[PDB]
RNA sequence: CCUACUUCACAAAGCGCCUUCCCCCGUAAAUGAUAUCAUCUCAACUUAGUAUUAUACCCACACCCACCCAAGAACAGGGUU
């Protein structure tokens, strides 16, 4: 249970998250 | 003139009677009268095209309520087509 | 060997450019009915109200009379056009 | 392929075993599927593949035997079960014995099912709108598969 | 049976399985030791 | 065109007889495409104070499909006035009980919430299987295409289909299976 | 965390949002935010959040 | 048709004479009704596909009653079959081997001794009543104050429910 | 880059091939040049147009009356060209611009009948508990247009 | 419901007499894969398991003078051969 937050600043957050590259090919696929 | 159907002008009694003598005027064979279309047969509200072929060539189409209102109406564009007084005929000039 | 709509119900319709690529050109000859896919002409208030619902697919309430004020609103001269 | 036959004298004896299809798309691929360009771009539906990875009683075969990616054992394993339930395996149907004949039993149409029927319990009481229960329809582990629609896979309902 | 949060086999015999939706710990050496994820 | 006024308006506004098959098809599905034609929205002479509603005909309601555990975890809510009156079954439990509860309900929700509701649920027929009255087959028009594609079984596809599907791997020898 | 920060794909970031008062967010943002850098709200810390 | 389990026969329709003690070899006293078969008919029969129903039919009639009292309708089908109206008309469920040709009188030995029946009529009227007579409410004291209040329904429904909930036991026709 | 036939080896939607360039190019002056040859014969019945006028999209045929909700400075029985023809519609072909046919192409000719005010409109403002309270009456000049005649010229 | 008993007496009552019908699901087990053993299976599955309970009741309609009623506030209902 975290204090509710400002919709802008919830907006915000969900914008600004970590997104994980993404190699074409699977490296596991790959030998 | 304007904006008036031709038979709203010109009452007419069996229209399939002038447009078979119409018809053996310009020595074409006899139209045949065929249902085309067809909706709800079995209810008190349906819909019934019927077509006139002459030689296997469609010359009109015409709905109705019941089948013998609908050749009447296929009649009557029949008739319409003949003599040129079609709703998307050339307007007239002024 | 390409259409963008199937040409078999309503009309043929043909898209084309003036050599200018101003103007769109649509001709749009209507489809007749074939001779082959046509088919030859073959040769007690409390039950009234049930027996209209049934014939015209309805519910029940059309078919009860409304009183003096709501008919004498109607208007019997409305205007028409076309 | 070897079958084991008792007559009591037992002794197992090797049928034709089927080989591989001669030249695949993507040599030096790792997974069986990664070689075929199979990766996302198969479902429950397609049975042709699923059909090849499953013992002739209904049961998945084996990581080690057949050489499937990890990742790509779980989605046939989920993908087969749903094929199953969906009723499109037929053939595949448990070894009952002789004298078990199985009951009439009410036949219900489904399909994209990813929890055994019996064990799933009703929703008699579904959430407001801010915290609904929602029925899954579909496996996540499909989720990674190609989407030619721009609404992503609703995995939800 | 009694129920539990988490699981923890208890002995050797022991052992874990996923029925009717939920984790169970089955024991038949010693039934004490039967668990319901709850 | 070069109608009478009256045959015209009668074309235009007439009433269309569709049918629909149920067999392996989601009832979200069918009630969506039903809730459309039962409205007259598919017309483009639509408008609400028009009525120009079409009947709606559709069989195998029995042979609907659900996606996920829908037949175990939807559940269908009625309350009779009375204390204690709050029953609450289970899709594939209505099913058994009516065979054509769980297309009408899907049906009638998707229809808009006003008085006109239950006049389009009269133009509604369901039928659990494939027999239809005489009547109802008489008025048909046109078969409306079914929603979702059923998929084939294994058995359904043909040799030619199966030997077209490469093998994707090769079994040891010495493997019992 | 640092491979997270150097590797994230994301465009956008809370502190250079934040920073530059990019949507006027400085309004729904506390000043200390700014050190923060949105790694921290209230008592409790994301170390999922770069 | 033999009798087969399953089948279901039709009953009767009798008039309550009244009633009698009986005494059993054991020593035990039973009171028993006496019920009278007046003019009991089988009148019509209906199968199952035109009853849109799940059984046969058999409409039985008793106690025949004044021509002149009765409608035009009942009078014509009466007339069809041959015989006088009848007060009452009953249907009783069948299967299809239990059906009987309308007309065929029925009697009191139709049951047997040891069989065991089921018995239907409209009770006995007691007009309006109150909630004491109607639904053996136990009312409210007499002395000790109790201003008005002797035979009243106390409280009909809950405070937080703004109605009276369908069904409730409330002074009417009993 | 072979992948077997599954489900969602292909996309749902079947493969479109549209006509070569050339072909099409010649196919085009083909279907312009007969739709000319019909304008040249006179083979169109009645026609239809779809004309810009007064911020508006009217739908107009010969013998059509528009109402124009603002003051023209015509007199009446003033005949005018309307200009910007969007579209231009027979029974059997139709010409459409980008977004105008030219001038040459097509001309419809409208003429002032009337010149009128509108029926008396009410504005009100109202706001409970506040003692705000408005009323104004609006009437808007009007003009009525009688659609003349529309032309085709075979200019393709 | 009124044959007796009791309050009482053309009847209403209890203190009197008569009748009263289906199950519930938590687990306990077979066969058997993923994970060639084993394993009750949010694997396909097999039994206890019953599933939608079902059956019962009701169901024809003069004149609507009047009279009567075991029907009833009025109205309505039953009888008047
Ligand atoms: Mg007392
Ligand atoms: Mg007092
Ligand atoms: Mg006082
Ligand atoms: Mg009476
Ligand atoms: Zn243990």
Redesign the pocket.
């Given at each position: 249970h975290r204090r509710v937050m400002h919709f802008q600043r919830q907006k915000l957050m969900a914008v600004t998250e970590y997104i994980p590259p993404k190699p074409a090919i699977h490296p596991s696929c790959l030998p | 003139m304007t904006g008036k159907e031709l038979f709203e002008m010109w009452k007419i009694i069996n229209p399939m009677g002038l447009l078979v003598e119409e018809l053996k005027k310009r020595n074409v064979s006899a139209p045949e009268s065929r249902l085309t279309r067809q909706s709800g047969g079995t209810t008190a509200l349906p819909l019934y095209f019927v077509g006139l072929y002459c030689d296997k060539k469609l010359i009109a189409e015409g709905p109705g309520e019941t089948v013998l209102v609908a050749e009447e109406e296929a009649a009557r564009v029949a008739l319409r087509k003949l003599y040129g007084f079609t709703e998307n005929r050339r307007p007239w000039n002024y | 060997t390409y259409s963008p709509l199937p040409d078999d119900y309503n009309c043929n319709v043909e898209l084309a450019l003036t050599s200018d690529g101003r103007t769109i050109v649509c001709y749009h000859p209507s489809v007749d009915i074939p001779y082959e896919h046509t088919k030859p002409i073959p040769r007690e208030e409390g039950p009234m109200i049930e027996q209209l619902s049934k014939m015209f697919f309805t519910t029940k309430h059309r078919w009860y009379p409304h009183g003096r004020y709501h008919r004498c609103r109607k208007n019997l001269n409305p205007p028409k056009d076309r | 392929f070897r079958e084991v036959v008792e007559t009591t004298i037992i002794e197992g004896r090797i049928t034709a075993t089927p080989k591989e299809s001669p030249n695949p798309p993507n040599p030096s691929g790792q997974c069986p599927i990664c070689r075929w360009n199979l990766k996302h771009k198969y479902n429950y539906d397609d049975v042709l593949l699923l059909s090849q990875f499953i013992?002739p009683?209904?049961?998945?075969?084996?990581?080690?035997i057949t050489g499937l990616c990890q990742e790509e054992?779980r989605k046939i394993?989920e993908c087969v079960?749903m094929a199953?339930?969906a009723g499109l395996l037929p053939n595949?149907?448990?070894?009952?014995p002789e004298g078990?004949?199985?009951?009439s039993?009410?036949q219900l149409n489904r399909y994209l099912t990813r929890?055994?029927?019996?064990?799933?319990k009703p929703i008699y009481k579904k959430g407001p709108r801010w915290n609904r229960v929602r029925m899954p329809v579909g496996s996540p582990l499909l989720r990674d598969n190609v989407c030619y629609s721009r609404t992503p896979w609703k995995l939800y309902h | 049976?009694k129920n539990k949060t988490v699981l923890k086999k208890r002995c050797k015999d022991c052992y874990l399985?996923?029925?009717?939706?939920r984790w169970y710990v089955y024991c038949k050496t010693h039934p004490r030791h039967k668990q319901?994820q709850m | 065109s070069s109608f009478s006024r009256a045959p015209q308006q009668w074309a235009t506004f007439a009433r269309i007889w569709y049918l629909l098959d149920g067999k392996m098809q989601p009832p979200g599905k069918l009630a969506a495409m039903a809730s459309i034609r039962l409205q007259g929205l598919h017309k483009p002479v639509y408008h609400a104070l028009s009525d120009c509603g079409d009947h709606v005909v559709i069989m195998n309601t029995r042979h609907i499909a659900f996606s996920g555990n829908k037949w175990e975890q939807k559940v269908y809510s009625s309350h009779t006035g009375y204390p204690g009156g709050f029953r609450q079954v289970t899709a594939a439990?209505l099913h058994?009980?009516d065979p054509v509860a769980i297309v009408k309900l899907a049906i009638y929700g998707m229809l808009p919430k006003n008085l006109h509701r239950r006049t389009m649920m009269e133009r509604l027929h369901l039928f659990p299987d494939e027999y239809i009255p005489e009547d109802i087959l008489k008025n048909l028009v046109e078969e409306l295409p079914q929603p979702r594609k059923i998929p084939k079984r294994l058995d359904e596809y043909t040799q030619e289909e199966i030997d077209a599907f490469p093998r994707l791997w090769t079994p040891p020898e010495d493997?019992?299976? | 965390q640092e491979e997270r920060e150097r590797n994230n794909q994301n465009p956008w970031t809370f502190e250079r949002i934040a920073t530059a008062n990019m949507l006027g967010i400085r309004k729904v943002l506390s000043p200390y935010d700014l050190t923060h850098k949105g790694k921290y709200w209230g008592k409790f810390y994301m170390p999922k959040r770069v | 048709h033999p009798w087969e389990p399953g089948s279901?026969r039709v009953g009767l329709i009798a008039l309550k004479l009244?009633?009698?003690?009986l005494w059993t070899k054991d020593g035990q006293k039973?009171?028993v009704t006496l019920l009278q078969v007046q003019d009991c008919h089988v009148l019509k029969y209906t199968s199952k596909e035109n009853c849109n129903g799940?059984?046969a039919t058999l409409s039985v009639?008793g106690k025949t009653?004044?021509?002149?009292?009765?409608?035009?309708?009942?009078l014509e089908?009466y007339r069809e079959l041959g015989l006088?109206?009848?007060?009452t008309?009953?249907?009783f469920?069948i299967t299809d081997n239990a059906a009987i040709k309308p007309g065929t009188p029925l009697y009191a030995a139709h049951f047997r001794p040891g069989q065991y029946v089921?018995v239907?009529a409209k009770?006995?009227?007691?007009?309006?009543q109150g909630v004491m007579?109607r639904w053996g409410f136990k009312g409210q004291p007499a002395t000790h104050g109790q201003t008005k209040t002797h035979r009243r329904p106390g409280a009909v429904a809950t405070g937080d429910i703004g109605r009276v909930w369908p069904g409730t036991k409330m002074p009417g026709?009993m | 880059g072979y992948v077997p036939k599954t489900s969602l080896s292909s996309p749902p939607w079947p493969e479109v091939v549209l006509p070569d360039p050339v072909e099409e190019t010649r196919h085009h002056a083909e279907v312009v040049k007969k739709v000319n040859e019909m304008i040249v014969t006179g083979q169109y019945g009645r026609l239809f147009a779809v004309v810009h006028f007064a911020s508006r999209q009217w739908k107009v045929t010969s013998e059509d009356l528009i109402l124009i909700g603002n003051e023209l400075d015509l007199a009446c029985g003033e005949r005018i060209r309307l200009e910007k023809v969007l579209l231009v519609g027979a029974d059997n072909f139709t010409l459409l611009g980008k977004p105008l046919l030219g001038k040459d192409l097509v001309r419809v000719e409208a003429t002032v009948i009337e010149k009128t005010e509108s029926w008396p409109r009410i504005i009100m403002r109202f706001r409970k508990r506040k003692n705000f309270k408005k009323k104004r009456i609006v009437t808007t000049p009007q003009t009525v247009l009688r659609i003349n005649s529309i032309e085709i010229a075979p200019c393709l």
């Open positions: - | - | - | 013992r009683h209904g049961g998945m075969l084996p990581r080690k054992h394993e079960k199953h339930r595949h149907r448990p070894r009952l078990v004949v199985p009951k039993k009410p929890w055994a029927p019996g064990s799933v | 049976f399985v996923k029925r009717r939706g319901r | 439990q058994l009980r493997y019992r299976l | - | 279901f009244g009633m009698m003690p039973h009171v799940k059984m009639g009653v004044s021509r002149f009292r009765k409608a035009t309708s009942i089908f006088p109206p009848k007060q008309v009953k249907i469920n089921d239907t009770t006995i009227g007691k007009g309006f007579k026709k | -």
